[PDB]
Symmetry: C4
Subunit: 330 residues, 4 copies
């Protein structure tokens, strides 16, 4: 083995991130304005815009969830708050019209109670929301939810970063699989634990397990630009979950912060010290970006441009697009 | 597949940019001063210097086109202005002697009218000038122009970044194919859409489709140094189109700008907000560089040096030169 | 040969460092809090925490050795001081309870005398501590110590960076092999001598020689983050030796230094000018980090997280984990 | 072809520079202090230290040549001055004892006259000193010198960057071949012409042509650290030529320059504007480094360390050492 030792499997793959690839233009009769951006969030739920906001306390509460649903996407309400409060946020969203909404639950002692209260509040999607979904407790929770409330609620499981982990969630009954271990802008898992998987490779691997079973993949973490959304979908994901890109919007929780004449909002990992109240997230800030509606327009605009360049009339067509790998110089 | 999934074609190639390669010196009896720098702009039109200025409103109006033709190259007049005005600029150039001139047209509602007015004004080259030429509307426009005015006017189509797209333009009747999707200094297509093709690979691919049919390739975008011109031609292009490298000259449109004691000129993408009046270009500035004649001398000087080092007596010989690929460290 | 010449062995391998790889998550029923972090320092000695402090005069004297042993690791007392003083430090440590302690010796004229005095003082581990252990004098010293005091004292040899060098130390009777030529944060061997071996590859190679003989590998140098400890162990090392990461602690030798409002401690290579009194180390500073106990908690916390993510119940299981290689972009 | 087009030879090799490789430690019974650093400058001339100073007007005049010879190396007097003056510098050196000295000549109209005057002055080595030696005029000059004065004077030819060019110089009768096109610290050939060859690969290729004919290779350009000297020799070169590393010494031509409280000396390419009086060099400055004797001691010290680490008793043994290739992260 050229990189050391005698075991070719020790270094199992070469992991590519978003910056490692570009989409190749292809024959097209699709104008960006005419592309259909709709896509499956879960087996049953199709969104007008293939974007969902992160279940983070500096990204998604009721205001964000309402704005995301109105924009054609969806919000996933964070779970760093009492069960009654999270449930009350679900009701607030549902009372602003027939709007889709999701909510995160963990696998701890109060997770089941949380899930049932969210169910009672009329949640559409439950997201089993963990740092490591390749584990029996997480798989059991997904399965139990699907068997209990699965007729009326779609159940997402995550996060994973390998084909095997995605396959396990599929077998457990997941209605979507969320991919991302290590890539988040505020994530320090890579440096604290030394663990992660570059996101393009993670998506390609998860999709290899999920697409044959008709289970959509949600690409979660590491998306810095609108072009990354196109790359994630072309790699085979069906939707993208955004934290950093939405944390600077008016609708996110938290106050405006003025530093050196410029406007920012705080954005922090759910595994940061402040969120926990061994951290694997940081507490930072992102530029203030104005209203969500405007940010979503720019993000969807970039996606539409990519669909035009690749001749992709639909997201399902975009999932078949090809990449060129680039070097450091590029 | 080492990079993920089970499809070896998903990541179709490894794309190299100018910075990824150097020209290897070879046996030479060619002194730089004795090299012949002439090259085909189109099937019929040969230039003394293999350089043309970008069809951009901060690069080429009549003054630039006149200076470029006098220097042995050519200007392509931008199309971000009324048809009558663009046509009047063509006439201004033609009235400054027997000077070659080109002009850009799009494929929109007024493109045909624009083309005919430019034809009437005595334009030598029509450049069908689009972000994505791999499309029936663009191919139809090239073909229609060639069948209508092709006896008296050479028709260039662009831009493309793949062998297949170049092949389509050849079939449509293009007299030259312009290559570049993503590499422009002011381009944000790569980050907005996630789309592009590193330019050395794009040129090698386009040339593979174009050279067998005797159709010259114009390398457009990403050229930062005179050495990049040599690299583009060695990769098989016949001419290079320059934006950034010429935007700082006296002959480009726009005022001098003084910032922090240094002189600059504004340079902006035609897909920037200001040019459009979802942007895929930025508005920036480039150092002021003085007269075009002087810039062209330096650029051609570097090209001549490369021709000497590679033993290339002509541009056709330079097109057969070899590269070494370099690493990040280099 | 694509990189030059006609000898494929001239460039013998592609060397990976810590930053080149990440650990892949895997199926897990191991919670970080439940992982067993114990590991072999030497054939006979197992530590509660797989960490030992560097034998450097800005890292380990008696105070550090006592704190490291209490934290479940071990200190290796530096040898840049008179034999009597080093021996007295061993006694100071042993008089603070039944604490494990190691001490460095060289191979110079006074090395044997030093070793015997340390033996008399009750040292548990002798570390034959050299820049280049692939040499008969070093091998002889290891062998002589093992045959003379090997029943009561474990003998470590280092440093090496290749499979062959590790194999030689094993044959000589080493109870552990210490790996690291070039990677230290304060090391300039790479630039002064042009010599080194990227640490992940060095560990994989040394382990290939050592593991089949039941000899533990100590990964020494280049560890910048807690995640690097997990990577080193997953590459097959049994413990990690830390310099930079511990030099900023209260227990390290040396005063606090205030520069630009921030607190630091001096940290210097043992091959720096100041330590020698042709340098292959620098004299620098590292941020002040507070008490060792706290630093060790954070480092072990990150290790525990990695064990959870990789489904590793023990360090021996972690040694079987897999990596993904990452690119520059990642 | 993964990088574009259908010709596998278009991108002929992957070029490595010094930063791309490290020397692997190997079995050693060689202490750095006991290594023999002598090496062939040319077929007949062996130096005590394998270093020669660049033929540049900010590096080598008589003072530098005298100091280099006394240190066990040699200086090559630059040729940017009248023939009589260069000849007078040769005599100045020869009058400071039995000191070896070289002098550069070109291939222009006055080159032969220059060579004969240098011959008359008692020069030991004539260096045919060009940007591109792969050319009949250069080959003819080398051959003519060797046939005319070759019994009493050793003739070096350069510079080359390929196996074929080195082979041509060997056939022409060169007593040494000098390698380096593109790597010089003050060189802009890479950006102006787009031409060059990463130096480790260039050396491996030149050596493949030269070593089988017993012709030493001088590695010229790109050496930034003492470790680069070891790498160049391990790649198969017999000596290293230094510009930047010696330009900051007391013995180099030019005044001390004080900028922002720090001392520098000017260092400029011989193809810079100022040296010429289309530039392919820049005019810069390097830190003041004090006396040559001290710089040479540090450089030879690093070389000796490498010889120790690689078990190389002589430079001929060092030429057989192995490398590990490193990544960007390393
Ligand atoms: O503290 C943390 N550590 C690691 N990942 C986190 C943390 N907090 C949130 N995440 C994940 O990072 C995603 C946001 O990534 P971003 O869009 O790149 O900022 C979220 O949707 C989570 O999957
Ligand atoms: O707004 C834009 N977005 C993307 N490409 C552009 C834009 N404007 C001009 N271009 C292209 O970029 C080329 C100039 O590239 P440059 O010489 O690297 O500055 C032009 O000739 C166009 O092909
Ligand atoms: O001066 C030096 N030159 C090269 N390596 C050194 C020197 N001093 C200590 N070391 C090694 O560097 C290790 C510390 O590396 P660090 O933890 O990255 O700072 C030590 O345990 C030694 O193996
Ligand atoms: O102007 C120039 N352009 C390109 N190479 C130069 C020039 N001047 C000197 N050189 C070469 O660069 C070498 C010095 O490289 P350095 O030691 O890296 O600074 C010299 O020995 C020459 O071979
Ligand atoms: Br601590 C910690 C908390 C959350 C995460 C995570 C990764 N992807 C989604 N959530 C990772 C670590
Ligand atoms: Br067909 C087609 C038409 C227009 C585009 C485009 C993308 N960005 C700007 N223009 C792409 C494809
Ligand atoms: Br919006 C937009 C406008 C122009 C371009 C382009 C790329 N190459 C030549 N022109 C791309 C995007
Ligand atoms: Br033949 C030949 C002669 C001179 C050159 C050259 C290039 N740059 C500076 N000198 C190249 C080839
Ligand atoms: Br000088 C000098 C002194 C110590 C080292 C070293 C490398 N790894 C452990 N110790 C290297 C060079
Ligand atoms: Br099973 C299992 C449970 C929790 C983790 C973890 C690592 N970092 C944060 N949480 C990993 C694996
Ligand atoms: Br202009 C010019 C002048 C000298 C060189 C050179 C390269 N290596 C040695 N000398 C290159 C270009
Ligand atoms: Br054998 C042998 C002995 C000492 C060294 C060395 C190199 N740098 C510092 N010490 C190398 C090899």
């Amino acid at each position: 083995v050229p990189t050391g030792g005698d075991d070719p499997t020790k270094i199992a793959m070469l992991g590519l991130t978003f910056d490692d690839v570009l989409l190749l233009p292809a024959a097209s009769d699709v104008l960006p304005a005419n592309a259909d951006t709709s896509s499956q969030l879960t087996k049953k739920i199709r969104l007008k815009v293939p974007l969902v906001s992160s279940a983070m306390d500096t990204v998604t509460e009721a205001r964000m969830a309402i704005a995301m649903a109105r924009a054609g996407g969806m919000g996933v309400l964070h779970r760093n708050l009492p069960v009654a409060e999270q449930a009350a946020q679900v009701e607030t969203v549902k009372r602003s019209g027939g709007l889709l909404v999701g909510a995160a639950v963990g696998v701890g002692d109060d997770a089941w109670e949380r899930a049932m209260a969210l169910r009672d509040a009329g949640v559409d999607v439950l997201v089993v929301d963990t740092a490591h979904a390749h584990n029996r407790k997480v798989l059991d929770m997904v399965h139990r939810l699907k068997t209990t409330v699965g007729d009326e609620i779609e159940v997402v499981g995550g996060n994973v970063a390998t084909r095997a982990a995605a396959a396990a969630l599929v077998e457990a009954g997941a209605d979507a699989v969320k991919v991302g271990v290590g890539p988040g802008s505020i994530c320090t898992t890579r440096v604290v634990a030394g663990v992660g998987a570059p996101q393009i490779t993670a998506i390609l691997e998860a999709v290899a397990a999920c697409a044959p079973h008709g289970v959509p993949v949600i690409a979660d973490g590491g998306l810095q630009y609108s072009g990354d959304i196109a790359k994630a979908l072309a790699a085979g994901a069906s939707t993208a979950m955004l934290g950093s890109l939405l944390a600077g919007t008016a609708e996110s929780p938290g106050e405006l912060i003025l530093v050196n004449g410029k406007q920012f909002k705080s954005y922090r990992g759910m595994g940061s010290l402040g969120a926990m109240q061994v951290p694997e997230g940081i507490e930072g800030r992102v530029p203030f970006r104005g209203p969500l509606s405007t940010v979503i327009h720019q993000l969807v605009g970039g996606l539409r441009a990519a669909m035009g360049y690749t001749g992709s009339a639909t997201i399902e067509e975009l999932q078949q697009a090809q990449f060129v790998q680039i070097t450091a110089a590029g």
